[PDB]
Amino acid sequence: MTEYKLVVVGAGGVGKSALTIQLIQNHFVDEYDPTIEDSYRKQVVIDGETCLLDILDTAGQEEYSAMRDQYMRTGEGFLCVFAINNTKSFEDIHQYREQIKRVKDSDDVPMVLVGNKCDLAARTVESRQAQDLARSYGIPYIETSAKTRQGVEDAFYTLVREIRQH
Numbered sequence: 072m073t074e075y076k077l078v079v080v081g082a083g084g085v086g087k088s089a090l091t092i093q094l095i096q097n098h099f100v101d102e103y104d105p106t107i108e109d110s111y112r113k114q115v116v117i118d119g120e121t122c123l124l125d126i127l128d129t130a131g132q133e134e135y136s137a138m139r140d141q142y143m144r145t146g147e148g149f150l151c152v153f154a155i156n157n158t159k160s161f162e163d164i165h166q167y168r169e170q171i172k173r174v175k176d177s178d179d180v181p182m183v184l185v186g187n188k189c190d191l192a193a194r195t196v197e198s199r200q201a202q203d204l205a206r207s208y209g210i211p212y213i214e215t216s217a218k219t220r221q222g223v224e225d226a227f228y229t230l231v232r233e234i235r236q237h
């Protein structure tokens with residue numbers, strides 16, 4: 072069938088693993104175990120097409136960031152994740168997009184900007200700010216909560232739909 076290689080990137084603690092695990096395994100990981108590099112696979116039907124999703128869950132911690140470049144190289148589409156209660160994670164999105172552009176040697180790589188932890192009330196990144204960033208990149212902005220599952224499928228499926236416009 073059709074395989075889509077998705078890669079989840081972004082600062083430490085923003086919820087990359089929680090997001091991926093919610094999508095693939097349908098539960099919320101409450102604890103924080105920093106990731107090195109993990110992969111998940113799942114068959115799903117997206118807009119009538121049977122899809123194999125290969126999802127790479129990457130390290131956001133510099134200390135665990137080892138050979139992230141080598142893992143990112145294979146990706147066909149990237150979720151760039153920040154947390155809406157972590158202004159620095161938003162400010163650092165550019166670093167991740169730059170790394171993507173380097174590893175893919177392209178300025179045209181499918182991506183979605185994701186503002187996670189939208190269930191939390193200590194918001195310091197307003198939707199409009201993130202929309203403006205996404206607009207400058209020519210990509211969608213979607214808010215998610217790995218905790219409530221809000222927007223989780225939408226984020227990943229939207230990325231698949233971006234890969235398809237490639």
Ligand SMILES: Nc1nc2c(ncn2[C@@H]2O[C@H](COP(=O)(O)OP(=O)(O)NP(=O)(O)O)[C@@H](O)[C@H]2O)c(=O)[nH]1
Nearest residue numbers: 083084085086087088089101105106131188216217
């Ligand atoms: N309230 C809330 N907490 C969340 C959400 N997503 C993740 N968390 C919490 O935030 C912490 C970090 O989540 P995690 O998914 O491990 O982050 P990460 O981006 O994978 N970290 P790392 O880069 O170190 O691997 C965990 O305690 C997790 O429960 C969310 O949408 N809402």
Ligand SMILES: [Ca+2]
Nearest residue numbers: 102103104105
């Ligand atoms: Ca643990």
Ligand SMILES: [Ca+2]
Nearest residue numbers: 173174175176
């Ligand atoms: Ca390069």
Ligand SMILES: [Mg+2]
Nearest residue numbers: 087088105106
């Ligand atoms: Mg993780």
Ligand SMILES: [Mg+2]
Nearest residue numbers: 195196197200
């Ligand atoms: Mg402000």
